[PDB]
Write an enzyme that holds these catalytic residues in place. Structure first.
Site, mmCIF file in Angstrom:
data_model
loop_
_atom_site.group_PDB
_atom_site.id
_atom_site.type_symbol
_atom_site.label_atom_id
_atom_site.label_comp_id
_atom_site.label_asym_id
_atom_site.label_seq_id
_atom_site.Cartn_x
_atom_site.Cartn_y
_atom_site.Cartn_z
ATOM 1 N N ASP A 1 0.859 -1.209 0.000
ATOM 2 C CA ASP A 1 0.000 0.000 0.000
ATOM 3 C C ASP A 1 0.885 1.245 0.000
ATOM 4 O OD1 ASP A 1 -2.379 1.510 0.239
ATOM 5 O OD2 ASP A 1 -2.410 1.314 2.446
ATOM 6 N N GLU B 1 3.092 5.335 -3.605
ATOM 7 C CA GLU B 1 3.113 6.405 -4.633
ATOM 8 C C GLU B 1 4.468 7.120 -4.695
ATOM 9 O OE1 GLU B 1 -0.605 4.745 -4.211
ATOM 10 O OE2 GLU B 1 0.320 5.893 -2.561
ATOM 11 N N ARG C 1 -0.785 -0.992 -4.844
ATOM 12 C CA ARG C 1 -1.617 0.193 -5.151
ATOM 13 C C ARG C 1 -0.990 0.955 -6.324
ATOM 14 N NH1 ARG C 1 -3.904 4.294 -0.620
ATOM 15 N NH2 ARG C 1 -1.954 5.436 -1.044
ATOM 16 N N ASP D 1 -9.157 3.169 -3.052
ATOM 17 C CA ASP D 1 -10.180 3.552 -2.046
ATOM 18 C C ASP D 1 -11.469 3.947 -2.753
ATOM 19 O OD1 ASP D 1 -8.295 3.000 -0.199
ATOM 20 O OD2 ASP D 1 -7.820 5.102 0.253
ATOM 21 N N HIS E 1 -12.861 -6.003 0.627
ATOM 22 C CA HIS E 1 -12.088 -5.193 1.607
ATOM 23 C C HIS E 1 -12.950 -4.001 2.005
ATOM 24 C CE1 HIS E 1 -8.965 -3.316 3.867
ATOM 25 N NE2 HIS E 1 -8.609 -2.410 2.930
#
Ligand SMILES: *[C@@H]1O[C@H](CO)[C@@H](O[C@@H]2O[C@H](CO)[C@@H](O[C@@H]3O[C@H](CO)[C@@H](O)[C@H](O[C@H]4O[C@H](CO)[C@@H](O)[C@H](O)[C@@H]4O)[C@@H]3O)[C@H](O)[C@H]2NC(C)=O)[C@H](O)[C@H]1NC(C)=O
Ligand SMILES: *[C@@H]1O[C@H](CO)[C@@H](O[C@@H]2O[C@H](CO)[C@@H](O[C@@H]3O[C@H](CO)[C@@H](O)[C@H](O)[C@@H]3O)[C@H](O)[C@H]2NC(C)=O)[C@H](O)[C@H]1NC(C)=O
Ligand SMILES: *[C@@H]1O[C@H](CO[C@@H]2O[C@@H](C)[C@@H](O)[C@@H](O)[C@@H]2O)[C@@H](O[C@@H]2O[C@H](CO)[C@@H](O)[C@H](O)[C@H]2NC(C)=O)[C@H](O)[C@H]1NC(C)=O
Ligand SMILES: *[C@@H]1O[C@H](CO)[C@@H](O[C@@H]2O[C@H](CO)[C@@H](O)[C@H](O)[C@H]2NC(C)=O)[C@H](O)[C@H]1NC(C)=O
Ligand code: A1IO9
Ligand code: CL
Ligand code: CL
Ligand code: CL
Ligand code: CL
Ligand code: CL
Ligand code: CL
Ligand code: CL
Length: 842
Positions: free
Chosen positions: A421, A424, A503, A519, A577
């Site tokens: 996760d 970025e 991600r 998300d 999730h």
């Protein structure tokens, strides 16, 4: 001279709001539009001139010279052009500074004809077969300044896809659309730069041919589409490194692209099972109950997950001695039951603990594994644990340290993969605790359309140092580099196929890992949006992709979670999730009729796993897609081009989900052919005979429309609550006959998790063929892994007349049923997938 058709006007003030006076001062035209730029280039605006063009065995070389500076600083006035004819399908050209090595993306690396414009300079690429113009960079000036590259081309049509990651239709709008590639932590929302960046597009041509373009550039960039139609690449650094893939089939374009960036990794079989997670499984007791509750209610579950809950003070490679004291025992139990275990890992490493108190940081600090700042110290930001340093996954020592930390933690808790996760990389403050310096990297002359209007927003300083280059150049690779590092870490720690879900991604991610769409809100809009996004990632060679089933943010509804479970069961990566403050959304948490619908969706997925596994085999060896849009399979039918609320699994399975509240039907497009309702296969028309048309199907709340294409054979396997159980079950064939009584299909089988299966030949490959009232297998390869697969059922669709007799290997079968209504012949057999058989009827 300023008489340029509005749709063909290229923006001469992309950098700032401009006045008519300033616009005309740049040598540009000022006409307010009656979006379309008001300040645009005349056809005579200074570009580069092509000089000293010469041919060789490799291709073409030339000098590009700009005489008149642009309005950007640090124009590079002399460039070198290199055109390389690499294969019959792949044309490759670079524009570089011959005087200085500029940043280049570190990646491992006829149907076309090429011509050039002298002044202004342009590269022109025709399709040899039909002479059509695919690329033409003469349409707008070439910009090549230290922190601003711009290259434009005509597009062959209004139909173009790619340029992830953005929440949008599969076909991008050419109405003055700006698409920003700058990996950013933000809940998927339209017009925003999201978690990943894939500078690739596939363009459709009239008649269903296609080509692809890859810009091998990892800098922050805008891609601007306009309705002429045309495209502009606007990057903030590096070089122009351009690949053109000639197809001509869209599926061939994708395969050609994946030849360059890498074929998708082969997942373990258990990875295609159901995954269940949430933030808020706050103990081993609570987590154990999830598996108990799923099992009690007969819901399949292969992989139990935890979010931040397991950690000690939200730190990687720790577990708390409160709710997670017996963490090792819980994971060993999961293994004893035949299940796998996954847990979240963040990139950022807590830096605040006293020296010697937190081994990952103490070791990372000593070994210099962290991204460092202007004064040569680790860049410190804020994430879940508090103050954190960020590992530099371009540093070989950081890779060794990451392998070490993963291996050590695996020795305490034997997890089966990594959920990576926040890569970025995500920062809860801007740049660093200490802010960022004032330099050209932090404050570039051209800032792409990023959320927050700065490269620093929600991430680390752009001028921070990594082993290979500055963060400015490497930011869009951060997630990818962590995925490579984690892939290697899991191979060394476990000695079997790694399972990494990331991600943040970049072009070539699929060779190492999978992806989830982040998300997403628990909304009907996000459910619908997930279909084009899952299709987009398959085109980009990341077939192992899904959205959080029933949505992550907010509270799902029972109806939404039913529809989302139905569609989500056709995500190549299927995980439910849920966020920390959300209502429970596990399948067992819903009403009886809802559970029934969710159990049915999961049962059908498990039955299809041998098929889905075979599709991943085709992705891994041939660069095929797993989930594909109708236009990839039927490109010559132009009605498919805009369809993105249906998906195929491979060539054969058409899924038409309900994506709206209160609907008991759905209208979907059906390419020319016969489509059998999969409900007629034991595990409302029996068959849709389509001319190529829209068809309204009944779709009550307990139903998702799945159709099997005539001409195809699909392998199935019996039920289980895990793949450990399901892989031991008898198998079945579903044989969808053409009107002419033909069908073809295949099975790939191996141990489901070993490395180097294809190299070592440790697999079974079987082809199925139906013709003239017979079904045979062809043995391409039979090994111990697959030789003992039991075939106990053959279901034939489109059998027009009731048979007098059904034979298995020349002997009447023990039992068969024929339904005159549905044209379905259901045959009980006792055969082995790996022994030649012949089933016949008359
Ligand atoms: C590169 O990264 C490093 C960290 O790896 C970073 O070091 C940080 O520098 C700042 C100062 O620049 C440190 O903050 C200081 O902390 C000490 C001790 O607690 C304080 O005494 C200092 O207080 C002075 O300044 C304050 C300003 O508000 C005044 O209020 C006060 O009166 C003092 O005059 C100051 O807060 C920080 O501790 C380190 N971080 C670490 C982990 O050591 C460095 O700044 C980075 N370089 C650049 C150029 O960004
Ligand atoms: C690649 O793109 C360039 C630019 O779009 C194309 O060149 C341009 O072609 C236009 C249209 O033909 C030219 O305008 C025409 O000029 C003639 C006089 O020569 C005039 O009689 C017409 O009314 C029209 O205005 C234009 O000169 C030319 N532009 C430049 C900058 O050279 C080119 O055709 C494209 N190449 C291919 C193979 O498609
Ligand atoms: C998501 O729902 C929760 C919980 O809502 C309550 O319990 C459900 C079973 C259902 O019966 C609801 O109608 C109930 O309201 C929401 O959490 C609530 O938030 C409000 C405001 O802070 C608070 O007054 C309630 O007591 C909270 N309940 C709990 C258990 O904390 C949450 O706000 C909802 N989120 C969204 C985005 O709608
Ligand atoms: C697993 O299921 C059990 C039984 O349904 C859940 O325990 C119940 O929780 C409800 C609140 O939702 C309580 O009212 C009851 O007291 C509990 N019943 C029993 C029989 O213990 C449990 O919460 C579930 N656990 C998870 C993690 O889903
Ligand atoms: O590990 C936690 C998590 C969600 C964070 C949501 C959040 C972030 C910041 C403030 C409040 C909530 N990180 C981000 C991931 O996308 C999501 O799946 C995770 O559950
Ligand atoms: Cl006008
Ligand atoms: Cl002018
Ligand atoms: Cl200016
Ligand atoms: Cl490869
Ligand atoms: Cl802290
Ligand atoms: Cl690397
Ligand atoms: Cl092979």
């Amino acid at each position: 001279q300023c008489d340029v058709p509005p749709n063909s006007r290229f923006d001469c003030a992309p950098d700032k709001a401009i006045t008519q006076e300033q616009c005309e001062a740049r040598g540009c035209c000022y006409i307010p539009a009656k979006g379309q730029p008001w300040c645009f280039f005349p056809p005579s605006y200074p570009s580069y001139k092509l000089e000293n063009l010469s041919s060789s065995e490799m291709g073409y070389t030339a000098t590009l010279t700009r005489t008149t500076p642009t309005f950007f600083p640090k124009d590079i006035l002399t460039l070198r052009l290199d055109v390389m004819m690499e294969t019959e399908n792949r044309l490759h050209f670079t524009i570089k500074d011959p005087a200085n090595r500029r940043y280049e993306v570190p990646l491992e690396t006829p149907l076309y004809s090429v011509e050039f414009s002298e002044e202004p300079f342009g590269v022109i690429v025709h399709r040899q077969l039909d002479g059509r113009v695919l690329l033409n960079t003469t349409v707008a000036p070439l910009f090549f300044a230290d922190q601003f590259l711009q290259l434009s081309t005509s597009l062959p049509s209004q139909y173009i896809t790619g340029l992830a990651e953005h929440l949008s239709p599969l076909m991008l709008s050419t109405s003055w659309t700006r698409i920003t590639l700058w990996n950013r932590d933000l809940a998927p929302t339209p017009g925003a730069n999201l978690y990943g960046s894939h500078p690739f597009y596939l363009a459709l041509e009239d008649g269903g041919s296609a080509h692809g373009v890859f810009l091998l550039n990892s800098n922050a960039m805008d891609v601007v589409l306009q309705p002429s139609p045309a495209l502009s690449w606007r990057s903030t650094g590096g070089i122009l490194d351009v690949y053109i893939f000639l197809g001509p089939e869209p599926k061939s374009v994708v395969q050609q692209y994946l030849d360059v960036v890498g074929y998708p990794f082969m997942p373990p079989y258990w990875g295609l099972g159901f995954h269940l997670c949430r933030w808020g499984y706050s103990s081993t007791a609570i987590t154990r109950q999830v598996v108990e509750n799923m099992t009690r209610a007969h819901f399949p579950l292969d992989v139990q997950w935890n979010d931040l809950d397991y950690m000690d003070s939200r730190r990687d490679f720790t577990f708390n001695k409160d709710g997670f004291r017996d963490f090792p025992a819980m994971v060993q139990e999961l293994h004893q039951g035949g299940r796998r275990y996954m847990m979240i890992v963040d990139p950022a490493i807590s830096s605040s603990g006293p020296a010697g108190s937190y081994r990952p940081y103490d070791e990372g600090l000593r070994r210099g594994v962290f991204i460092t700042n202007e004064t040569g110290q680790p860049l410190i930001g804020k994430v879940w644990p508090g103050s954190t340093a960020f590992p530099d996954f371009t540093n070989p020592t950081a890779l060794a340290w990451w392998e070490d930390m993963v291996a050590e933690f695996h020795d305490q808790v034997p997890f089966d993969g990594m959920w990576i996760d926040m890569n970025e990389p995500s920062n809860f403050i801007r740049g660093s605790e200490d802010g960022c310096p004032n330099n050209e990297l932090e404050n570039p002359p051209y800032v792409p359309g990023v959320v927050g209007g700065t490269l620093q927003a929600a991430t680390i300083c752009a001028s921070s140092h990594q082993f290979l280059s500055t963060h400015y150049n490497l930011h869009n690779l951060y997630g990818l580099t962590e995925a490579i590092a984690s892939h290697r870490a899991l191979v060394k720690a476990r000695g079997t196929r790694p399972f990494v879900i990331s991600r943040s991604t970049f072009a070539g991610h699929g060779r190492y890992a999978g992806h989830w769409t982040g998300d997403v809100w628990s909304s009907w809009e996000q459910l619908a949006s997930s279909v084009p996004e899952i299709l987009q990632f398959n085109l980009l060679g990341v077939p192992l992709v899904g959205a959080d089933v029933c949505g992550f943010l907010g509270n799902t509804s029972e109806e939404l979670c039913v529809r989302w479970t139905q569609l989500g069961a056709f995500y190549p990566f299927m995980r439910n999730h849920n966020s920390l403050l959300s209502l429970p959304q596990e399948p067992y948490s819903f009403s009886e009729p809802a559970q029934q619908a969710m159990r049915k969706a999961l049962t059908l997925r498990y039955a299809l796993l041998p098929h889905l596994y075979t599709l991943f085999h085709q992705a891994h060896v041939a660069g095929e897609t797993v989930a594909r849009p109708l236009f990839l399979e039927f490109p010559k039918d132009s009605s498919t081009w805009t369809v993105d609320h249906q998906l195929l699994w491979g060539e054969a399975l058409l899924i038409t989900p309900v994506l709206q509240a209160g609907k008991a039907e759905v209208t979907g497009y059906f390419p020319l052919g016969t489509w059998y309702d999969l409900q007629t296969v034991p595990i409302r028309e029996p068959a849709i005979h389509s001319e190529g048309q829209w068809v309204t199907l009944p779709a009550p709340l307990d139903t998702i429309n799945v159709h099997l294409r005539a001409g195809y054979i699909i392998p199935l396997q019996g039920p289980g609550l895990t793949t450990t159980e399901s892989r031991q079950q008898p198998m079945a064939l579903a044989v969808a006959l053409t009107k002419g009584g033909e069908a073809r299909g295949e099975l790939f089988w191996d141990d489901g998790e070993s490395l180097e299966v294809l190299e070592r030949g440790a697999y079974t490959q079987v082809i199925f063929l139906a013709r003239n009232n017979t079904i045979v297998n062809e043995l391409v390869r039979v090994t111990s892994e697959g030789a003992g697969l039991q075939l106990q059922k053959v279901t034939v669709l489109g059998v027009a007349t009731a048979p007098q007799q059904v034979l298995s290997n020349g002997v009447p079968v023990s039992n068969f049923t024929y339904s005159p209504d549905t044209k379905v012949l259901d045959i009980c057999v006792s055969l082995l997938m790996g022994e030649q058989f012949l089933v016949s009827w008359c």
